[PDB]
Every structure is written in C-alpha cells, then in structure tokens.
C-alpha cells in the first residue's frame, strides 16, 4: 500500500527566489489525467498535460524547456506513462479511507442577537465537522422552504480534514413560529433537522 | 473535470522553510516529508497505518527542485517576486459555548513568499501551549495559505489575536477575535 512518485524533470526586503512544482492527478470515470507544473516564484512557465501528450511553455521563460523535453522521446514516454502508472497506482491504494472517508456533520441552530421575538434577526445554522465538503443546508419556516434571505458563508475548510458552513436566514419571528435547518450529506442516511421555536 | 484531485505540491526557496514536499488529496494535505528528520509525517494516524511513503522520494524531488531553482535564478536574471500580503481570518472550529473546549483557527491566506511569523495572543499575551499549525499550503494561483490552531475554552472575559508577520506587510497584522 505504497505511494509512488514522479521525479520532476531537471532544468539545466530580503533576497528570496522560489521554485514550485505541482504533480496533479485528476481521477474521473476510471481515467487519470496528469498535470506537471514548473513554477518560478508564482509564474508557471512550463507544464506537461497528459491530454496534450507533450511539454508546453506556459510563458516564454519555459521555451528552452518545452524545446528540450519535446526533443527527448525518453522523457516524453516517461511523462506519458504517469496517468496509468503513479496516478492510477496512488488512486487505487485509497479504499474506504480517503476515497470513502465520511464524517458526520454536527448541526447547531442559534439566533445572531438575543431579545424580543418581533424585530429583524438572523437565525444561524452552524453545520460543523463534516467530510466530504459537499453539503446541502436548507431553511424551513413552518414546513415550507425559505429560499429568500438565506446568507451563506459558503464552504469553509478547517484544514484538519473537516469542513464547516454557516447558513443563516433573515427572519422576523412571530410567537410560535417553527424554524427548521435541514442538512443532507453523504455521511448521513437521512436528513439531520435542527429546530428553533420562536419563544 | 475530476471526481478527485490527488496532487504532489512542492517548493524550494532561499528563506525558511528552505523547502517543502507534500501530497494532498482534494485540497487537504495527507502527508509531507520532514526534510530535516528525513521521514514522512502523516496528517491523521489512519493514513500512516493504511499507507506508506518512502521519504527518499520527497528528498529526491526537493534536490531536483533546488537544481531547478538555481537554473531559474540565472535565467530570470535574479528576478525576485513581489511580496503578496496575507488575508487573515479568525474563526472557531465549533460553535462558541462558554465553558466548552473549542479550537480557534487562524487562516493566513493569499500570501507569497511562504515566509511568515505567526503568534497567538490571549489578552495581549503570547500563547505557547495548545498551539498547532499547517504547512505552507499550496494554492492553484501559486500563492500560499496556512492554518494556525489554538485550543481554548471560551469565556466572555477573554479576547484573542492572531499576530501575523509577512514581508508584504508594512507592520505586523493582528486579527482580533471575541
């Protein structure tokens, strides 16, 4: 169950110069597409797209590299082998660990401001700790869906393999009104609904 | 077009961190190579147990990238990039419930180069404990982002600051939190 690499091709305020590399594998419908990027500072100057089948000088700073690598069938055939080699291999390692990692969302409904139940207020649905990022967060007022006045922060990555989202509705609560936040996610077998009663 | 994006991202530069080799699955970092310790560090224990990564792969890629850096310092006639200042956001991991342990996240985003100083402040005082951090995480725009963490217990008579330092900043930037 080992991770495989592709060796980047060899080329050739305080003082600082940076070189960045990117080896991206895009898995879709049993296929793999590979993108090798050579970036000087923030300038991607030369790249290899498996869909192109050859190196291309993204900027003119990569013209010597595009020229040289494309003149070398050994380097071209090695880079072309990447989608079916390391991309495929690495993708096929990850069983229900990364490809099927599921973390259930924790849901909390709380109004933004405290006070009398008649005025303008924001009702917050703080959906937390889920994985993957794809989530559906709906707002309901007395069983009917509220589409208008829904202020969303959009998907927030916590950088710890969990996400969060704050979906809030602009509400003018009347006494006895039932506000329901409904979350749908792959980790959930049924929707998770959290209620707020007007008070 | 992709169901998933598995990517190896690496950088090499003159200032600290002098290099970084990492692997990310769907924008989240799975593992990286501690270049000094010459060993793989996994993000979650369940990764280290399920998989392996020979750290030599990381070191080999960094050596090539250092060669590539040198060639480009020359080719570009020592072109140093503009220092892109960071956008800093502070937000809790969990909803704030006074008395219940939570984690404060500091997201230092959209900066270049990956040369940064970050400190957590509780009531204007430096916090040394319950602190963790991400690597200099890659962005599709070849800029960087980083996450700093602080385990804290929310109390109304406490405030927090994320004091960040970057070259693109005229002075340290403090992002305040409740």
């Amino acid at each position, epitope marked *: 169950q080992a991770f495989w*690499i592709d060796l980047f091709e060899t080329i050739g305020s305080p003082e600082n110069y940076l070189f960045q590399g990117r080896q991206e594998c895009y898995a879709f419908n049993g296929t793999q597409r590979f993108l090798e990027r050579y970036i000087y500072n923030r300038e991607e100057f030369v790249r290899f797209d498996s869909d192109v089948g050859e190196f291309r000088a993204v900027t003119e700073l990569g013209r010597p590299d595009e020229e040289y690598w494309n003149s070398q069938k050994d380097i071209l055939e090695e880079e072309r082998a990447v989608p079916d080699r390391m991309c495929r291999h690495n993708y096929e390692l990850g069983g229900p660990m990364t490809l099927q990692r599921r973390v259930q969302p924790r849901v909390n409904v709380s109004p933004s401001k405290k006070g009398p139940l008649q005025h303008h207020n924001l009702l917050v649905c703080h959906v937390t700790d889920f994985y993957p990022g794809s989530i559906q967060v709906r707002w309901f007022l007395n069983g009917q869906e509220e589409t208008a006045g829904v202020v969303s922060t959009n998907l927030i990555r916590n950088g710890d393999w969990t996400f969060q989202i704050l979906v809030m509705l602009e509400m003018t609560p009347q006494q006895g009104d039932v506000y329901t936040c409904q979350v749908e996610h792959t980790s959930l077998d049924s929707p998770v609904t959290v209620e707020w009663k007007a008070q | 077009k992709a169901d998933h994006v598995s990517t190896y991202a690496a950088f090499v530069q003159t200032h600290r961190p002098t290099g970084e080799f990492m692997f990310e699955f769907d924008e989240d970092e799975m593992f990286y190579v501690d270049l000094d310790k010459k060993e793989t560090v996994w993000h979650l224990e369940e990764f280290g147990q399920a998989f392996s990564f020979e750290a030599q792969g990381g070191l080999a890629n960094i*050596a090539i990238l250092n060669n590539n850096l040198n060639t480009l310092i020359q080719r570009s006639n020592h072109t140093q990039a503009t220092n892109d200042p960071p956008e800093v956001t502070v937000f809790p991991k969990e909803p704030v419930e006074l008395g219940q342990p939570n984690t404060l996240i500091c997201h230092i985003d959209k900066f270049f180069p990956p040369v940064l100083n970050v400190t957590w402040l509780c009531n204007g005082e430096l916090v040394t404990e319950g602190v963790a951090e991400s690597l200099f995480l890659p962005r599709t725009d070849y800029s960087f982002h980083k996450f700093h963490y602080l385990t804290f217990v929310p109390s109304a008579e406490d405030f927090y600051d994320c004091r960040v330092e970057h070259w693109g900043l005229d002075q340290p930037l403090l992002k305040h939190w409740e």
Partner: T-cell receptor
Amino acid sequence: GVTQTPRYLIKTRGQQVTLSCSPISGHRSVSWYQQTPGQGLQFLFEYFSETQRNKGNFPGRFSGRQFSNSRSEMNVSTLELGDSALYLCASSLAQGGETQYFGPGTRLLVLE
Amino acid sequence: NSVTQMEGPVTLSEEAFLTINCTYTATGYPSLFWYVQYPGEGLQLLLKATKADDKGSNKGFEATYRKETTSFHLEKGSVQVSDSAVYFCALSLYSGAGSYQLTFGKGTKLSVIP
C-alpha cells in the same frame, strides 16, 4: 555513446578491480550488470545524482560510486574465479532509469 | 517478479517467421521491453510497450503487451541475417523514489542462416 574502460582485463584471484563508465550526455541514471553464461544478466546497482538508488544481491566486495558529472565506477575486491564475466554499464536519460543505453562492457577474467 | 522467455538457441533460415516467446509474472503495473544484443556489443532497446494492448514496433519486429496471456511474444515476419543476435525480454517495475528497475529474462540466441 556509453563508454566503458578498460575493455578487457586479466586478474589473479584475490586482487581488486575498478571499472569506469562514462554515460551519454546528459544521462544521470547509471546501472551496472554482471553478464555470465551461467546466470545471464544480474543487476549490481544503480546510481542517480551520486546516490545508489538500488542494489542487487551481490556481496559487499561489489561496490560502486557515481561522481557529480554522472561518471560511475564499480569495484570488486577479493576477486574470485566466478567473478569472471562481462560488466555491463547502462545509462538512462529518463530519470526513472527504464530506457537504458548499454556500454560495450568490461570483459573480466579472473585466474589462479 | 520474473521474466520467463523462450529457451535455447533458435536457428532459422533467412526470410523465416520468428517467434520468441516471453511471459511475465509481476506486480500489477509493469512496462514491457525487448532488448537486442548483437554479437560483441552490449544490449540495445529494440521495442517497448507501456500498458496492456500497446504494441512495440521496430526493425520489422513486433510484440504486443497481452494482459490476458501475461506475455510480450516477439514476432518477425521475415528475419534477415542481420537479426542474428541475442534477444532479451524485460520488465520495468517501480523501485522507489520515482525509479524503476529492469528485470531481464534469460537471453535467447538467434542464428539466422542465409
């Protein structure tokens, strides 16, 4: 392209040999093989950027090195009669080292 | 992880049909090769195939990467006297740090009789 020196060698059991390899410009992957009628092609070791990436199953007396210019040298100490073989050297431009370019070899004969 | 190829020294008349059998047994992703060793020199790449169904073609020789039979059988329609050499079948498997190691079969000598 791939050059190997010396072309032919006669040694007595117990002596030592150093075999040089000049890979093609600018191949950095250098592999060494022992060719025998008895065992065929037997992998010795492979070098890339001075480091020994892989090693075959040969005793410690069979050692190798690679210089900054990618040239390689292999050494066989405490020579045995059974070390008599063709010491092939192969370079590769592709850094993975699959597409190999073989040298003419060093024909080594070990005698009593 | 081995390469099993056609035994002993094959001897054929000029213009004959050649088949040098080669079967592999390896860890899911190998690339397949045919190396040729002409009398007196070192090996030389003749043909290669990356993935299953890929065909290697050079000097009128052809071998198909066949996953079904796990084989890379070398074929030539009409052999030339110049083809007298020793043919090696080979595997390419990942050997760490983005490197690959060749695994050769025990060579097949071919004598083409004019």
